[PDB]
Amino acid sequence: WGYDDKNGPEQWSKLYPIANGNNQSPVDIKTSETKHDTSLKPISVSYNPATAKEIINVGHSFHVNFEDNQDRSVLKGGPFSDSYRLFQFHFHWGSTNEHGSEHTVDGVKYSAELHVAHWNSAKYSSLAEAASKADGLAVIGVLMKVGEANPKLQKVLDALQAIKTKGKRAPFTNFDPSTLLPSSLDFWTYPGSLTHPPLYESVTWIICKESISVSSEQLAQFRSLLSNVEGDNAVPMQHNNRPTQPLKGRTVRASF
Ligand SMILES: [Cl-]
Numbered sequence: 001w002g003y004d005d006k007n008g009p010e011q012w013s014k015l016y017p018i019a020n021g022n023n024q025s026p027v028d029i030k031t032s033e034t035k036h037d038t039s040l041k042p043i044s045v046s047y048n049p050a051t052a053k054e055i056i057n058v059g060h061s062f063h064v065n066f067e068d069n070q071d072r073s074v075l076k077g078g079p080f081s082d083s084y085r086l087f088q089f090h091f092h093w094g095s096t097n098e099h100g101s102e103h104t105v106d107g108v109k110y111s112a113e114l115h116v117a118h119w120n121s122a123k124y125s126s127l128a129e130a131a132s133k134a135d136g137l138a139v140i141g142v143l144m145k146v147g148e149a150n151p152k153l154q155k156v157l158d159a160l161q162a163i164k165t166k167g168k169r170a171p172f173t174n175f176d177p178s179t180l181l182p183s184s185l186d187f188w189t190y191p192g193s194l195t196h197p198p199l200y201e202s203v204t205w206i207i208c209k210e211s212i213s214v215s216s217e218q219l220a221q222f223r224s225l226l227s228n229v230e231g232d233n234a235v236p237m238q239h240n241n242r243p244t245q246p247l248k249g250r251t252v253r254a255s256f
């Protein structure tokens with residue numbers, strides 16, 4: 001599976017029949033159809049920069065991993081009753097600077113998207129177990145709009161030189177991903193899935209109401225990582241966003 005004409009999104013069902021499930025992500029958020037839910041609390045994120053651990057090129061993307069041994073870095077509030085432990089952050093982008101986000105708002109596709117993932121440590125003993133459960137994961141999604149360069153992304157951009165090709169990894173320490181979220185405490189939430197294989201329907205989405213910026217030159221940098229292993233022929237990481245999927249009756253709730 002990948003994002004090419006041959007093993008891409010429109011072919012994932014041949015292999016993962018859940019790709020055509022009822023709670024597939026991402027989705028288009030129609031602001032005229034969202035539902036205000038007065039029970040939604042403000043999200044509370046409390047991350048410990050010492051839990052930052054490594055950066056790795058996985059082929060279709062790059063992941064920034066955190067030690068998830070204890071509850072030093074957690075997310076509380078919003079729609080939840082339990083606390084979710086921080087395990088990673090990653091990005092989605094497209095072949096063009098204008099259209100590469102996964103979630104869309106009122107039919108409008110953004111430039112890119114940041115996903116901050118956490119697992120339910122209050123009910124599951126590990127991420128492996130929790131990943132396939134309805135309440136297993138919580139992911140904060142932040143829409144990225146091309147404009148002014150975002151200086152908060154720097155340390156991440158700088159680390160990329162060390163993981164140019166597939167399987168490469170490097171220490172990535174003393175970082176607080178809360179530095180990347182917008183000031184706004186308002187969001188949309190809906191039940192869904194991972195946006196790539198295995199496509200498990202175990203994610204409760206938290207989509208920020210506010211977007212962050214990024215310049216075209218920062219995006220070109222993501223686009224420059226290679227999908228191939230070292231020594232082979234260059235194949236860039238051109239794109240990795242999945243098209244929106246039908247809502248099939250789910251409700252998108254708003255905290256405002
Ligand atoms: Cl929020």
Ligand SMILES: [Cl-]
Nearest residue numbers: 115194195196
């Ligand atoms: Cl995902």
Ligand SMILES: [Hg+2]
Nearest residue numbers: 094095096239
């Ligand atoms: Hg694309």
Ligand SMILES: [Hg+2]
Nearest residue numbers: 090092115195
């Ligand atoms: Hg993702």
Ligand SMILES: [Hg+2]
Nearest residue numbers: 186187207208
């Ligand atoms: Hg948010």
Ligand SMILES: [S]
Nearest residue numbers: 184208209210
């Ligand atoms: S946000």
